[PDB]
Amino acid sequence: KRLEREQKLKLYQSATQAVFQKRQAGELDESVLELTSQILGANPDFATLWNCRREVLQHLETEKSPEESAALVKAELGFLESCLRVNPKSYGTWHHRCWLLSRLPEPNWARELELCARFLEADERNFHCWDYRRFVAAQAAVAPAEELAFTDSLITRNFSNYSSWHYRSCLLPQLHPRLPENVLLKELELVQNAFFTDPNDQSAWFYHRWLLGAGSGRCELSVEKSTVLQSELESCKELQELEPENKWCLLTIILLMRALDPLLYEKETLQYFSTLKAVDPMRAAYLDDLRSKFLLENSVLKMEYA
Amino acid sequence: QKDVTIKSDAPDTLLLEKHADYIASYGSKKYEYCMSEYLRMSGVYWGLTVMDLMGQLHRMNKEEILVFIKSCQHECGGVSASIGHDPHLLYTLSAVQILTLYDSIHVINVDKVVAYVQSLQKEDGSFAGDIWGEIDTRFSFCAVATLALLGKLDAINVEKAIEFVLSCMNFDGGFGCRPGSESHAGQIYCCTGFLAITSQLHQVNSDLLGWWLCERQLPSGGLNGRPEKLPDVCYSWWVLASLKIIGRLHWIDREKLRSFILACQDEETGGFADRPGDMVDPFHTLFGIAGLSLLGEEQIKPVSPVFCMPEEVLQRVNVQPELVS
Numbered sequence: 196k197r198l199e200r201e202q203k204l205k206l207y208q209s210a211t212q213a214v215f216q217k218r219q220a221g222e223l224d225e226s227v228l229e230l231t232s233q234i235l236g237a238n239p240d241f242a243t244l245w246n247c248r249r250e251v252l253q254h255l256e257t258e259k260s261p262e263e264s265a266a267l268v269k270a271e272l273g274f275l276e277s278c279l280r281v282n283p284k285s286y287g288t289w290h291h292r293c294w295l296l297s298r299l300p301e302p303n304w305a306r307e308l309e310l311c312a313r314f315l316e317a318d319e320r321n322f323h324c325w326d327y328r329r330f331v332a333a334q335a336a337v338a339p340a341e342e343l344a345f346t347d348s349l350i351t352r353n354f355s356n357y358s359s360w361h362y363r364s365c366l367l368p369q370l371h372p373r374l375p376e377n378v379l380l381k382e383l384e385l386v387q388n389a390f391f392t393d394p395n396d397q398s399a400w401f402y403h404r405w406l407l408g409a410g411s412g413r414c415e416l417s418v419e420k421s422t423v424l425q426s427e428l429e430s431c432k433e434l435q436e437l438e439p440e441n442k443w444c445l446l447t448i449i450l451l452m453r454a455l456d457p458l459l460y461e462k463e464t465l466q467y468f469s470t471l472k473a474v475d476p477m478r479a480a481y482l483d484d485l486r487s488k489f490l491l492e493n494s495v496l497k498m499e500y501a
Numbered sequence: 502q503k504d505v506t507i508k509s510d511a512p513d514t515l516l517l518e519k520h521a522d523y524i525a526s527y528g529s530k531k532y533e534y535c536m537s538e539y540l541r542m543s544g545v546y547w548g549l550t551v552m553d554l555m556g557q558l559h560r561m562n563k564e565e566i567l568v569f570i571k572s573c574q575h576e577c578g579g580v581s582a583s584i585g586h587d588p589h590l591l592y593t594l595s596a597v598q599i600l601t602l603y604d605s606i607h608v609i610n611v612d613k614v615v616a617y618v619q620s621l622q623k624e625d626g627s628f629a630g631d632i633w634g635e636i637d638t639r640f641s642f643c644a645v646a647t648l649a650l651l652g653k654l655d656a657i658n659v660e661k662a663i664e665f666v667l668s669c670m671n672f673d674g675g676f677g678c679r680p681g682s683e684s685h686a687g688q689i690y691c692c693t694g695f696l697a698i699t700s701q702l703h704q705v706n707s708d709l710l711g712w713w714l715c716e717r718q719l720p721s722g723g724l725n726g727r728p729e730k731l732p733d734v735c736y737s738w739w740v741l742a743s744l745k746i747i748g749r750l751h752w753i754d755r756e757k758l759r760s761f762i763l764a765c766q767d768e769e770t771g772g773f774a775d776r777p778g779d780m781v782d783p784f785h786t787l788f789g790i791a792g793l794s795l796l797g798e799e800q801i802k803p804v805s806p807v808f809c810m811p812e813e814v815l816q817r818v819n820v821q822p823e824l825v826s
């Protein structure tokens with residue numbers, strides 16, 4: 196342990212030394228690509244070395260044949276993919292890939308989308324990869340509807356869904372292009388499946404709270420939406436019975452009652468705040484402030500009675 | 502549900518003497534340190550700031566650090582992490598924070614720093630980190646914090662910068678790296694700090710964002726950086742500082758968080774780790790100490806939630822953005 200890393204250190208130190216010497220000498224060649232490959236594998240956050248690689252690739256592009264140039268970029272893609280397998284959360288590595296692809300005549304975007312699907316099946320929460328996927332989708336002019344279909348299969352195949360629900364929150368407005376009610380109802384159905392399938396799973400509850408605000412007034416509640424929301428309310432009460440320590444369903448009961456009729460449900464809303472605070476005491480201060488806000492809203496509604 | 506379980510013999514007292522000793526001798530033990538030279542300037546900033554919060558700044562090497570900083574400013578005006586490395590907004594900010602701590606801003610060429618920052622703004626208002634063009638709201642914060650400390654916020658296109666940052670606001674009230682990016686505590690800190698500096702906190706949904714942030718607190722008392730992740734002491738900074746900026750610091754359980762932060766100390770070596778019983782480092786030492794200050798620990802100087810520097814320093818340069826409450 197302690198010995199072998201005294202060796203590694205002096206290797207990285209002399210290779211680092213060697214790279215900086217070559218750079219000061221203006222030697223922008225495959226030397227320096229060889230040296231930095233040996234350092235960036237274990238230390239991808241060494242930003243200056245990614246810069247050195249770019250300076251070399253730029254220089255060589257001017258002095259090499261188009262086929263030699265093409266060969267260097269394919270080698271770079273393989274290098275990059277090997278680096279990502281060891282450290283998939285390095286800002287520098289993902290940016291270098293983006294820099295490289297943006298430069299190309301040329302680029303094979305469907306292959307890059309596949310790379311993304313592969314990294315996301317390993318870690319569905321890797322934000323770097325989701326950011327890269329959005330980059331690739333915009334470059335390839337992938338339509339929001341295709342990306343929407345990708346997110347569905349991801350949410351249903353397993354949990355760890357916050358990143359995929361978040362992506363849906365951005366896509367849905369684009370394909371729209373404040374959701375239309377037919378879309379909102381279908382989303383509510385999808386999310387309500389999720390949180391009844393895995394009531395633990397905070398991401399569906401967060402997305403549902405957004406959906407509850409993303410509609411028309413209420414009360415310009417349609418009979419269909421009124422009925423759907425009332426149905427949700429009763430389903431959450433059932434889940435409360437199955438899972439008495441589940442705080443998300445309790446909060447959602449409160450929010451549904453707000454969405455339906457604040458004044459008619461005043462009594463129940465207050466009862467639910469008490470239960471919820473006992474179940475989730477770390478959020479007592481938040482919940483008291485939420486209750487205070489809701490009561491002030493109620494006073495305004497009552498004072499609107501002429 | 503992913504959480505740590507704190508052990509019953511976890512430290513439950515603040516060990517300031519040990520932390521000051523740890524930071525004072527950091528990088529002298531010499532060591533595989535070495536490794537992290539690509540962030541040296543920020544490392545220096547973390548050490549100096551935490552020492553100043555603890556009243557121990559004098560035990561660090563002011564004259565040495567000023568020569569180091571001067572040697573890291575490049576011809577373009579930007580500052581690198583270390584000698585021979587390339588300039589970047591991250592290390593330009595750290596350098597300027599250090600010089601602010603030391604009331605030594607004219608050690609570097611301020612006009613050229615301003616010109617460097619100005620040069621990295623894009624047409625949509627965003628900022629690249631350097632000439633290679635990585636766009637991140639981190640760099641929006643670095644740009645306006647650097648300029649605010651220099652009295653030069655007027656040098657950039659502020660309305661366009663605000664527009665870009667607001668385009669990064671999400672369904673859940675938070676902010677990510679770039680438009681479309683998922684909410685992350687780290688980016689929320691950068692963005693709420695940015696909006697504080699530019700006087701735009703009225704554009705944040707404080708109740709919605711505050712809720713998302715307070716739901717970062719796990720049963721252990723520690724905070725994570727997004728849903729379904731493990732807690733980490735540096736979120737005691739990212740999350741609390743954001744909550745303070747938006748007037749909702751009381752939405753977390755302060756005693757439970759304080760207990761978690763104290764459990765991350767190493768009682769033998771000093772310093773703080775990311776989680777109880779892991780290896781300590783200066784980054785987590787600063788953020789643990791700064792978190793405790795936000796929570797009102799008497800032995801630690803009050804810390805600015807926007808700049809992560811002692812408030813007395815910001816008062817001296819007269820840069821204290823108004824927060825929500």
Ligand SMILES: CC(C)=CCC/C(C)=C/CC/C(C)=C/COP(=O)(O)OP(=O)(O)O
Pocket residue numbers: 591639642643685686687688690691726739808809
């Ligand atoms: C204190 C100060 C003045 C800072 C300057 C601004 C700055 C660099 C903020 C960092 C923001 C952050 C922690 C982002 C997520 O990074 P990550 O990808 O490491 O997050 P993770 O590994 O926890 O997921």
Ligand SMILES: [Ca+2]
Pocket residue numbers: 558559560561562563
């Ligand atoms: Ca000294």
Ligand SMILES: [Zn+2]
Pocket residue numbers: 733734735736775785
């Ligand atoms: Zn951390």
